[PDB]
């Protein structure tokens, strides 16, 4: 049900940028070339098939530490989740997350949710 | 609205930047390109830069340019902040029509100058 | 005055209109209960 | 006739709105605000202060200081202290 | 019974103007939402503590459970500001308050002589079950819960919390059920 | 690039229409107020895109 | 010959109109803040009494 | 929200666009107009197309909130949706209101 949405969105977008393209002085062959370039990339990344793929007051640093390198947060391959938040809540170190409309690319697989509820201690 | 180039009030920001350095106490004559570089609006496009010179700079009534480089225009006199006693000595000039807007920024806060003035013969009265 | 005229005076009076949104107040039937202190 | 309500219902409704948009705003980016004001000034040479207050999320007192800097307020004989660009 | 301190709130001046937005983007675990409040809320895990770091350079630290813990946490927050690159100084680390809690271990009812006189005691059942015994000689506010837990608040120094509890102990002993 | 230049000349005819828009600058006021709202929205969305870049 | 009822009506008639006028003024102010009014607190019980 | 541009879908698009400019097929500015169209299209498709009811849990690390957008980073987490379960030890969550 995901390749379907993507086709759906690509189709819709292509038909709306078609007008922009022609009004900016563009042959429709270059619009079809964009579609082809777009499809190629996904078919090369092979992350999924699809219907288009079918085709002292100063010496403050003496003790130091207390904080950690900020690089542990960024990998660029880290499971990235995009979602919409309804309510985020925190009492003491207890956090509760009320999320919605999310696309979760985790363990390499792709998932989707209309609502996600989570719990975590900080 | 006649003709406007790129962002509205680019000239007003250019005037503010020219004012800021003079209040800071670092005073240098600046070409229109140099002020644009300071505002980071230097890449405004060739036509927009030409528009600023042809209309925005011309529109200002007190705009002053020595030659290649533009000069401070709101106050023709430099904000020295010094020789106030000499300005008082000529009573007819009466401080050359000194304005509070010019003061409190010439090179120091007015309150510090007022403490120095109170010790000196100079007296300050604001109608 | 109690049995009839009072109902007639409240029942028949200008409608309250006050407005964006507007607010409408309509009066209905007056009730009078025995004297009580 | 008399009930025992704790928070009047009308008062509770304003609270959620008063919270949602915490009063007004802060005091920053005056040059960025000036460009938006200039676009409004193009639409009308003299602009009502109340209309400008609706345009800017920032507090009225901060907006008034920026407006005074751009131009002196002119009553125009119609009141509202309409704001116009300085001739200088 | 010895009261145990539960909260120390302290103010320390870093000494210089701080740009709040820059601190939020770099310092880890630092939330700065301008609309709700005007300060960066920064939290550290090693000694539990939540600190509001204000824009003009005044810092208020909360959540520490002893005198030393509050000072150590404040020093760590100042060190983080130095790591960001803003000049950092430690000025007048002064405690503002220490809330303390203790249990008398006996049931308490003060209602019998409250009717005759309540000069230092104010109690309204609807507003709260606890009675507030604002005390003047040692400035503190002691609240008596019917069960017997007494929470002392407002003491600028450790000794005041202990002195007030000893002072209020005879009154409760008299009204012991 | 000469076709690009003549397309620019028709854009200049559009700019003569823009000189009519200079005479134009009621209903025009409502549209430009909508444009002011859009400029505020654009500052907010540019900040949102900056946030997405941190996410990127 | 006017009697007790037809004289009390003349007095009651105007006073009820006065409660209605007052309800308008009080709620009007509240509607302006957008607060919304409560007619139970808007009626001033003493205008008729 | 130019939120969904750094996604597989969105990046493949940008890359495709960059190349056309380099080979003198398309130009920039028109490319920005295309991205703008994309924003409207992806946002619209998300809110009204597919929905799934799920249940979940995690363990926190960094958090950030600016421009009404929350960005978290959890470590040693576990997200199960319906039958399927995931075992993640480093997950970044970006959430718009």
Statement to judge: residues E21 and E91 lie in one domain: yes
Q: Are H65 and H42 in contact (CB under 8 A)?
A: no
Q: What is the distance in angstroms between the Cα of B47 and the nearest Cα belonging to chain F? A: 14
> D42 and F43 in contact by Cβ < 8 A?
no
Indicate the CATH number for domain H1-51: 1.10.287.190
Please work out, in degrees rounded to the nearest 5, the angle formed at the alpha carbon of residue E18 by the alpha carbons of E14 and E19: 160
- Which of E65, E95, E125 marks a domain boundary? E95
Residue E46 DSSP one-character state = T
Choose, out of F8, F20, F22, F39, the residue to mutate when testing the contact with B (most B CBs < 10 Å).
Answer: F22
> F7 and A80 in contact by Cβ < 8 A?
no
Q: Which residues of chain B neighbour D87 with C-beta distances below 8 Å?
A: 61
Give partners of A (≥3 CB pairs < 8 A). E, F, H
Residue ranges of domains in chain D: 22-84
- Which of E60, E95, E130 marks a domain boundary? E95
CA D50 distance to own-chain centroid? 6
CA-CA distance, E60 to E95, in Å (whole number)? Answer: 10
Six-digit token string for D18: 């008063």
> G16 and C13 in contact by Cβ < 8 A?
yes
D71 assigned to a ligand binding site: no
- Burial (CB < 10 A; 0-12, 13-18, 19+), residue H1, is buried
Six-digit token string for B83: 């020789």
User: Phi and psi (nearest 5°) for B25?
Assistant: 105, -5
Q: Which residues of chain D neighbour G36 with C-beta distances below 8 Å?
A: 10, 13
Which residues on adjacent β-strands are paired with residue A115?
A100, H53
Residue D47 DSSP one-character state = B
Statement to judge: residues E27 and E103 lie in one domain: no
Q: Which helix (H) or strand (E) holds H81?
A: strand H80-81
- For A113, other C-beta atoms within 10 Å of its C-beta total 24
Say what the alpha-carbon torsion angle E133, E139, E141, E147 is, to the nearest 10 degrees. Answer: -70
CA-CA distance, A5 to H43, in Å (whole number)? Answer: 12
CA-CA distance, E5 to E98, in Å (whole number)? Answer: 6
Six-digit token string for E13: 């001046």
> F48 and H71 in contact by Cβ < 8 A?
no
Statement to judge: residues E85 and E14 lie in one domain: yes
Statement to judge: residues E50 and E111 lie in one domain: no
Q: Which of B27, B127, B18 is nearest to B81 (CA)?
A: B27
Closest Cβ–Cβ partner in D35, D87, D88 for B9: D35
Strands A79-91 and H91-96: parallel
Distance set, CA E158 to CA E10, E162, E165, F26 (Å): 14, 7, 12, 70
Q: Which residues of chain D neighbour G34 with C-beta distances below 8 Å?
A: 14
> A63 and E82 in contact by Cβ < 8 A?
no
Q: For residue E33, what is the nearest residue in chain H, using CA coordinates?
A: H66
Q: What is the distance in angstroms between the Cα of D39 and the nearest Cα belonging to chain B? A: 7
Q: Which helix (H) or strand (E) holds H21?
A: helix H8-22
Q: Length of chain G in residues, anyone?
A: 49
Q: How many CA atoms lie within 13 A of D5 on its CB side?
A: 11
Helices (H), B52-122: 57-59, 84-89, 110-119
Say what the alpha-carbon torsion angle E23, E25, E30, E32 is, to the nearest 10 degrees. Answer: 80
Numbered residues of chain F with Cβ closer than 8 Å to any chain A Cβ: 3, 7, 55
Experimental technique, in short, is cryo-EM
CA-CA distance, C23 to H4, in Å (whole number)? Answer: 45
- The helix-helix angle for H8-22 and H30-47 (nearest 10°) equals 160
Closest Cβ–Cβ partner in E46, E88, E90 for A66: E46
Contacts 24+ apart (CB under 8 A), D33-36: D33/D58, D33/D63, D33/D66, D34/B9, D34/B12, D34/D66, D34/D70, D35/B7, D35/B8, D35/B9, D36/F36, D36/F39, D36/F40
Six-digit token string for D24: 């007004």
Q: What is the distance in angstroms between the Cα of A62 and the nearest Cα belonging to chain H? A: 26
**Which regions of A2-122 does DSSP assign to beta strands (E)?**
79-91, 94-106, 109-121
Please work out, in degrees rounded to the nearest 5, the angle formed at the alpha carbon of residue G25 by the alpha carbons of G24 and G27: 70
> H2 and F45 in contact by Cβ < 8 A?
yes
Count the helices and strands in chain B (H runs, E runs): 6, 2
Q: What is the distance in angstroms between the Cα of G22 and the nearest Cα belonging to chain D? A: 20
The parent domain of residue E150 ranges over 1-9+96-177
User: Phi and psi (nearest 5°) for A23?
Assistant: -70, -25
Residue H5 DSSP one-character state = G
Choose, out of D28, D31, D43, D57, the residue to mutate when testing the contact with F (most F CBs < 10 Å).
Answer: D43
Which residues on adjacent β-strands are paired with residue E42?
E30, E51
Q: Are H78 and H58 in contact (CB under 8 A)?
A: yes
Q: How many CA atoms lie within 13 A of B117 on its CB side?
A: 18
Statement to judge: residues E104 and E127 lie in one domain: yes
Statement to judge: residues E20 and E72 lie in one domain: yes
Q: Are E98 and E7 in contact (CB under 8 A)?
A: yes
Q: Which helix (H) or strand (E) holds E80?
A: helix E67-84
CATH topology of domain D22-84: Arc Repressor Mutant, subunit A (1.10.10)
Please work out, in degrees rounded to the nearest 5, the angle formed at the alpha carbon of residue D61 by the alpha carbons of D59 and D63: 70
Q: For residue H70, what is the nearest residue in chain E, using CA coordinates?
A: E31
Q: Which of D49, D86, D88 is nearest to D70 (CA)?
A: D86
**Surface of H (30-89) touching A: CB under 8 A:** 30, 33-34, 37-38, 40-42, 44-47, 49-62, 70, 73-74, 77, 79, 81, 84, 86-88
- The helix-helix angle for A2-23 and H8-22 (nearest 10°) equals 30
Statement to judge: residues E54 and E127 lie in one domain: no
Distance set, CA E9 to CA B7, B11, E20, E61, E143 (Å): 49, 50, 21, 6, 20
Q: For residue A77, what is the nearest residue in chain F, using CA coordinates?
A: F56
CA-CA distance, F42 to D36, in Å (whole number)? Answer: 12
Q: Which helix (H) or strand (E) holds H63?
A: strand H62-66
Residue A73 DSSP one-character state = G
- Which of E66, E95, E124 marks a domain boundary? E95
Indicate the CATH number for domain H52-97: 2.30.18.10
Statement to judge: residues E80 and E119 lie in one domain: no
Residue ranges of chain H assigned to CATH 2.30.18.10: 52-97
First vs last C-alpha separation in chain C: 22
Residues whose CB is less than 8 angstroms from the CB of residue E5 and which lie 6 or more positions away in sequence, other chains included: E65, E66, E67, E98, E99, E100, E158, E161
D32 assigned to a ligand binding site: no
Q: C11-30 burial, b for 16+ CB within 10 Å, e for fewer?
A: eeeeebebeeeebeeeeeee
- Burial (CB < 10 A; 0-12, 13-18, 19+), residue E12, is buried
Q: Which helix (H) or strand (E) holds G11?
A: helix G4-33
G17 at interface of C, judged by CB pairs closer than 8 A: yes
Statement to judge: residues E40 and E89 lie in one domain: yes
> E32 and H66 in contact by Cβ < 8 A?
yes
Residues whose CB is less than 8 angstroms from the CB of residue B96 and which lie 6 or more positions away in sequence, other chains included: B77, B87
- The helix-helix angle for B32-39 and B10-24 (nearest 10°) equals 90
CATH number of the domain within which E64 lies: 3.30.310.10
Q: Are H3 and A7 in contact (CB under 8 A)?
A: no
Residues whose CB is less than 8 angstroms from the CB of residue E72 and which lie 6 or more positions away in sequence, other chains included: E47
> F54 and H5 in contact by Cβ < 8 A?
no
B126 at interface of F, judged by CB pairs closer than 8 A: no
Six-digit token string for B71: 């000069």
Unique residue bearing structure tokens 């001046």: E13
Unique residue bearing structure tokens 């666009």: H17
């Amino acid at each position: 049900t995901v390749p379907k949405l993507y086709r759906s969105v690509i189709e819709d977008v292509i038909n709306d940028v078609r007008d922009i393209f022609l009004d900016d002085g563009v042959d429709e062959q270059v619009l079809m070339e964009l579609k082809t370039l777009w499809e190629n990339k996904l078919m090369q990344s092979r992350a999924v098939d699809g219907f288009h793929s079918e085709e002292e007051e100063e010496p403050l640093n003496s003790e130091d530490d207390v904080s950690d390198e900020e690089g542990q947060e960024l990998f660029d391959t880290e499971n990235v989740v995009v979602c919409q938040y309804d309510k985020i809540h925190r009492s003491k170190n207890k956090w509760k997350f009320h999320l919605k409309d999310g696309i979760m690319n985790l363990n390499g697989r792709d998932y989707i949710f209309s609502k996600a509820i989570g719990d975590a201690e900080w | 609205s006649g003709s406007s180039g790129y962002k509205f009030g680019v000239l007003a920001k250019i005037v503010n930047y020219m004012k800021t350095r003079h209040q800071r106490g670092d005073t240098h004559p600046l070409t229109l390109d140099e002020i644009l570089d300071e505002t980071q609006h230097l890449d405004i496009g060739l036509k927009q830069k030409q528009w600023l010179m042809t209309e925005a700079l011309v529109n200002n009534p007190k705009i002053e340019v020595i030659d290649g480089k533009y000069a401070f225009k709101p106050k023709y006199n430099v904000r020295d902040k010094k020789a106030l006693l000499r300005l008082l000595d000529q009573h007819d000039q009466r401080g050359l029509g000194g304005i509070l807007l010019e003061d409190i920024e010439e090179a120091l806060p007015n309150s510090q100058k007022a403490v120095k003035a109170l010790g000196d013969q100079i007296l300050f009265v604001n109608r | 005055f109690i049995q009839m005229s009072v109902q007639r005076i409240v029942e028949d009076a200008p409608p309250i209109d006050l407005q964006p949104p507007r607010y409408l107040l309509k009066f209905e039937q007056i009730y009078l209960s025995k004297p009580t202190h | 006739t008399n009930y025992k309500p704790v928070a009047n219902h009308q008062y509770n409704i304003e609270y959620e709105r008063k919270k949602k948009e915490d009063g007004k705003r802060a005091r920053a980016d005056k040059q960025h605000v000036l460009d938006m004001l200039f676009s409004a000034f193009e639409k009308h040479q003299y602009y009502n202060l109340k209309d400008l207050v609706d345009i800017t999320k920032q507090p009225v007192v901060y907006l008034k200081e920026i407006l005074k800097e751009i131009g002196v307020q002119n009553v125009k004989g119609i009141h509202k202290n309409t704001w116009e660009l300085k001739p200088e | 019974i010895v009261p145990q301190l539960q909260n120390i709130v302290s103010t320390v001046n870093l000494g210089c103007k701080l740009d709040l937005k820059t601190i939020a983007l770099r310092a880890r675990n630092a939330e700065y939402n301008p609309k709700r409040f005007a300060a960066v809320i920064m939290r550290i895990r090693e000694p539990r503590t939540t600190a509001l770091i204000f824009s003009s350079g005044k810092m208020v630290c909360t959540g520490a459970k002893s005198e030393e813990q509050s000072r150590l946490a404040a020093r760590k927050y100042a060190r983080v500001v130095q790591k960001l690159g803003f000049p950092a100084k430690f000025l007048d680390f002064k405690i503002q308050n220490m809330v303390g809690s203790c249990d008398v271990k006996f049931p308490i009812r003060l209602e019998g002589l409250v009717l005759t006189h309540q000069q230092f005691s104010s109690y309204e059942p609807e507003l709260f079950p606890g009675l507030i015994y604002r005390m003047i000689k040692p400035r503190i506010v002691l609240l008596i819960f019917v069960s017997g837990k007494v929470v002392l608040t407002g003491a600028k120094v450790r000794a005041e919390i202990y002195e007030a509890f000893e002072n209020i102990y005879p009154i409760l002993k008299g009204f012991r059920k | 690039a000469q076709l690009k230049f003549f397309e620019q000349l028709d854009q200049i005819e559009k700019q003569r229409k823009d000189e009519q828009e200079r005479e134009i600058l009621q209903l025009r006021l409502k549209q430009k107020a909508k444009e002011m709202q859009q400029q505020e929205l654009a500052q907010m969305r540019q900040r949102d895109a900056n946030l997405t870049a941190l996410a990127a | 010959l006017d009697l007790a009822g037809p004289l009390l009506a003349f007095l009651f008639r105007g006073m009820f109109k006065n409660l209605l006028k007052e309800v308008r003024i009080y709620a009007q102010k509240f509607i302006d803040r957008g607060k919304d009014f409560n007619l139970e607190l808007a009626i001033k019980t003493r205008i008729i009494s | 929200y130019q939120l969904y541009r750094n996604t597989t879908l969105g990046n493949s698009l940008q890359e495709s666009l960059d190349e056309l400019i380099q080979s003198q097929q398309i130009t920039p500015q028109l490319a920005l107009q295309v991205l703008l169209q994309f924003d409207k299209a992806i946002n619209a498709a998300l809110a009204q197309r597919v929905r799934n009811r799920v249940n979940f849990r995690g363990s926190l690390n960094t958090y950030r909130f600016c421009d009404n957008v929350w960005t978290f980073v959890l470590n040693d987490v576990e997200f199960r949706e319906v039958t399927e379960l995931i075992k993640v030890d480093k997950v970044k969550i970006v959430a718009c209101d």
